[PDB]
Amino acid sequence: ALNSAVAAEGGYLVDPQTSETIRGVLRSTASLRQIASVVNVEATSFDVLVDKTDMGS
Amino acid sequence: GGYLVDPQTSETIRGVLRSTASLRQIASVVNVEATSFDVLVDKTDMGSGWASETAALSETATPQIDRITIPLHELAAMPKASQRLLDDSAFDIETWLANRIADKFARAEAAAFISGDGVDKPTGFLTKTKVANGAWAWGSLGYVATGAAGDFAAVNASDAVVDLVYALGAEYRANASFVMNSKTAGAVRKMKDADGRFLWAEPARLMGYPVLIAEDMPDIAANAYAIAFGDFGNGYTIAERPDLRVLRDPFSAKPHVLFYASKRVGGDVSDFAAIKLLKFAA
Amino acid sequence: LANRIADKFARAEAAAFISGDGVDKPTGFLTKTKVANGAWAWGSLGYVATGAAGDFAAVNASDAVVDLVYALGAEYRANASFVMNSKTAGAVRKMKDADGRFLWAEPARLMGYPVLIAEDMPDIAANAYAIAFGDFGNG
Amino acid sequence: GWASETAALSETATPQIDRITIPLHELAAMPKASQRLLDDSAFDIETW
Amino acid sequence: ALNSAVAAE
Amino acid sequence: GGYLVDPQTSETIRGVLRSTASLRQIASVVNVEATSFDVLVDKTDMGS
């Protein structure tokens, strides 16, 4: 019941409260995914079909 | 009949209005009703595979976890107020002091959150075993240096600030803040081109990024860390109780009231990469 | 862990989307048979060059960036993005006029166009492709 | 304070209070307007 | 504040 | 992960046990109110 500084005089009653959420170092989430063309695909591959030339008028 | 005019006093007792810029509105304020606070951060990270079709995938790493314990100190101030004053001074002195003691506390712990040392008070980030950036360890804050001693760089000035920015990590720079005292921010603003025009153009943002004008960091000295920068939303953790518990003391000072009030607060650095500093040595 | 493994994956494939090679992982656009712009073929990406080797152009600096913009096609420049690592973007920002004032003025947009600070492209080397630009919505 | 665990916390200062008295003077101006003008000059001279 | 004797407190 | 685990504190505080029987239950317990209780005992016999 004495001071909270030294352990023997009731310093073992203070039981430090931990975090609510385990934090972490926060690394770069800049991944080009938010600027590229994200396509859902449930397959083995994906096949874009682009046009390398054009018509004439 | 000059004794009939009885000058009307104020409605509200005013006061000098001191700097409320306390880093509390930019740091990570955490409610805690305990003796301490324990952040649990991750100093490393995992590894990824790109496993082949026939690989029989093996083990990978796992982020080892580093605890920092917040001390969560107490802070008290104790004015001595006379009982005769508190009964005859129709301005409400009790709520005036509690409105004024709180403004001292939010002004006292601004030194604790930034330039506080270890004992009995939170360590601000300035006293956290500074390491020059590039050899960045975990248990230490990074800094870049300027070059010349008592000023910014001489030949190419204003480049010690921009690399301080671009060494803070691309994720941390998303919501960061400069921290200076108000007499260094003049010496930054006084920098000018070869033409005599000063080059940097309420929030007093600098290079777009917000600037918290603190009042605790040293100025441009020989080896001072005058300019701070980083993401204080992850870098610094403030732990506190959200009240200002007042105990009036009618008994010790017998003709006095002796307000004893104490809110208790703690907090030190949380993410060592989320703050970079500026040394002026070399 | 599932909140942390996902943050590694979105950090691991950022190297795949940009500097990934062919085997077992996506090829980012850096390893796609670079061709100098003007002789632009189909199965290859264009590039412009700077001039001097380990830095930007010496006499007229900052003109290797603006022609990189105006060789991207008028339709693609409508919603494009610069891509650099965070240590090159300093060396871009450190460029200055003859007066000592640095010339380029959250999104950290450059010449108005948005900039995605990646963390995978090389810095200013002898023959590195340090600065990327274009319409990644179609590219 | 930043009082230690075993400190027996002592007194502290208290903001001494300074009064400034506003004098609250009066200010007057007195134009002289003719009664003949105020009755025949349909612009409302009083509120003007 | 302090005493009611001297004004400035 | 050793920081991620924390012990249970307890259900309550315990203590070493002490002796209870204290001569209070065998002696004469007299409820008194003034500052002092006075017994009046005669020192010697009648001596007839």
Numbering used by the authors:
A (entry chain A): 89 to 145
B (entry chain A): 98 to 298, 305 to 385
C (entry chain A): 194 to 298, 305 to 338
D (entry chain A): 146 to 193
E (entry chain C): 89 to 97
F (entry chain C): 98 to 145
Kindly provide excerpts from the paper associated with this entry.
Gene transfer agents (GTAs) are DNA-containing phage-like particles produced by some species of bacteria and archaea. The genes encoding proteins that form Rhodobacter capsulatus GTA particles (RcGTA) are derived from phage DNA, which has been integrated into the bacterial genome. Here, we use cryo-electron microscopy (cryo-EM) to determine the structures of RcGTA before and after DNA ejection, and to visualize the interactions of RcGTA with R. capsulatus cells.
The existence of RcGTA particles with icosahedral heads provides evidence that the assembly of the oblate capsid is not based on intrinsic properties of the RcGTA major capsid protein but may be determined by scaffolding proteins. The quasi-equivalent structure of the T = 3 icosahedral capsid includes conformational differences in the major capsid proteins from one icosahedral asymmetric unit. In the major capsid proteins that form hexamers, the N-terminal arm, core helix from the peripheral domain, and extended loop lie in the same plane. By contrast, in the major capsid proteins which form pentamers, the structures are bent 18°, 8°, and 10° towards the center of the capsid. The planar quasi-hexamers in the icosahedral head are formed by capsid proteins in two alternating conformations, depending on whether they bind to pentamers or hexamers of capsid proteins. A particle of RcGTA with a T = 3 quasi-icosahedral head would not be capable of transferring its complete coding sequence; however, it would increase the chance that a combination of a few particles could transfer the whole coding sequence in segments to one recipient. If the RcGTA particles with icosahedral heads acquired the ability to preferentially package their coding sequences, they could become self-propagating and revert to a bacteriophage-like lifestyle.
